[PDB]
């Protein structure tokens, strides 16, 4: 029954704004990706190339979003890098869930090309795709909106990670986004907001597992004689 404070409304407005602002790669980058078919490559090599090369842009977008969150500039550079490295994959899972299409049971990429189970399988990434799509489905079933996604992303970014220097400050920043999420959920979900707050916080727990599942590729790739782009390899300690 407790209402949103004006500061919290400003915060949420900023979050929604940033999320919309850094949601898609530039048309230039995408056009550059579609227009480099190297040498007569097969459908598989094409799918893999698109998935990885776009994933690079996705990570860059994640950084752009993170460095604009209130609180982020209060941290030591070391802790910023640590957080980003540790959370980029999870945030990536949320971004992916935001582009899930129920009807086709597929993920719609920024180039409007739908990627299905078979797209990923053909790319060489079949071992994990069902878990990915299942997360997308669960997420969809919760009917999560823009503010909730933004706030969740902020909360994921400011989570406790190994090798933090000022972990307490991170925790303190995270508290604010938690409370904003709780109040938002209280005031803007109908008829009430039974347990949807805790239900949203379970998403974090699942994101740990998914992040592990994303680290757990690239050994699978090496076994298939395939290769992560070096940026991603470094960023995910692979």
């Amino acid at each position: 029954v407790k209402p949103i404070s004006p500061e919290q409304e400003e915060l949420i407005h900023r979050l929604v704004y940033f999320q919309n602002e850094y949601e898609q790669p530039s048309d230039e980058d995408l056009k550059r990706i579609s227009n480099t078919p190297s040498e007569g490559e097969d459908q598989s090599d094409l799918n893999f190339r698109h998935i990885t090369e776009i994933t690079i842009l996705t990570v860059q977008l994640i950084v752009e979003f993170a460095k604009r969150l209130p609180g982020f500039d209060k941290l030591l550079r070391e802790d910023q890098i640590a957080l980003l490295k540790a959370c980029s994959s999870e945030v990536m899972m949320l971004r992916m869930a935001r582009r899930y299409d129920v009807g086709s049971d597929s993920i719609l990429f920024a180039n409007n090309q739908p990627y299905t189970r078979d797209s990923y399988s053909l790319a060489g990434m079949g071992e994990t795709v069902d878990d990915l799509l299942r997360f997308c489905r669960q997420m969809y079933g919760m009917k999560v909106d823009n503010a909730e996604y933004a706030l969740l992303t902020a909360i994921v970014i400011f989570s406790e990670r190994p090798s933090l220097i000022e972990g307490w400050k991170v925790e303190k920043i995270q508290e604010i986004y938690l409370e904003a999420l709780k109040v938002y959920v209280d005031n803007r979900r109908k008829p009430a907001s039974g347990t949807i707050f805790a239900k949203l916080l379970s998403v974090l727990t699942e994101l740990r597992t998914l992040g592990n599942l994303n680290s757990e590729m690239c050994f699978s790739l090496k076994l298939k004689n395939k290769k992560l782009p070096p940026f991603l390899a470094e960023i995910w300690d692979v």
Binding site: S159, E175, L178, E179, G194, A198, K199, N212
Partner: protein
């Protein structure tokens, strides 16, 4: 400090784990296959949560049972060598700082146990309803018991991701290898669950 005693302790932890699950309200009324699945999935998180919470009184150590507390030098020999540090840092220290009581620990572990996202369930909706009941109850309890701190519910819930991460450092079911027979884990669970 001795091997055999540690083994006895951890085995006892397993038995106690199953006993605890058995007496959580509405759990034993689920189809037994579902109980086996839920316990298999939560096995590590549940154990780790329990002994983390038992380790708060002790300093720089993990209590694994009656008169058996393990420090870093013996951690590997105890079977906890790989998660020792993160357990002390993200769990024990945290449980101590915020004074996590037993009702809250039980709530959290209930939440872990009642995971409707576990694959292969028959009664998934029922499990979800149970988890929801636990959420509501826990929020109520923290709202009443400690009203001075309004961010306590979320702070408790934030230990669940930490538990999942630490539990994942284990590519095996914790302590199971020190049971005596060649009894498979599903058989051990089936036997220990059915009356």
């Amino acid at each position: 400090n001795a091997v055999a005693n540690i083994c006895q302790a951890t085995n006892s932890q397993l038995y106690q784990l199953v006993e605890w699950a058995k007496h959580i309200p509405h759990f034993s009324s689920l189809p037994i296959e579902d109980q086996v699945l839920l316990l298999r999935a939560g096995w590590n998180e549940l154990l780790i949560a329990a002994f983390s919470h038992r380790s708060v009184e002790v300093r720089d150590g993990i209590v694994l049972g009656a008169g058996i507390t393990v420090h870093r030098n013996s951690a590997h020999q105890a079977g906890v060598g790989t998660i020792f540090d993160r357990v002390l840092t993200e769990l024990v220290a945290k449980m101590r700082d915020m004074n996590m009581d037993r009702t809250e620990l039980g709530s959290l572990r209930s939440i872990i146990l009642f995971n409707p996202e576990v694959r292969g369930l028959k009664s998934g909706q029922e499990v979800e309803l149970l988890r929801e009941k636990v959420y509501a109850a826990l929020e109520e309890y923290t709202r009443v018991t400690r009203p001075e701190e309004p961010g306590r519910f979320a702070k408790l819930l934030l230990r669940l991701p930490a538990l999942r991460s630490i539990g994942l450092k284990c590519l095996e079911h914790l302590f199971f290898f020190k049971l005596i027979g060649d009894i498979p884990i599903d058989t051990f669970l089936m036997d220990m669950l059915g009356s």
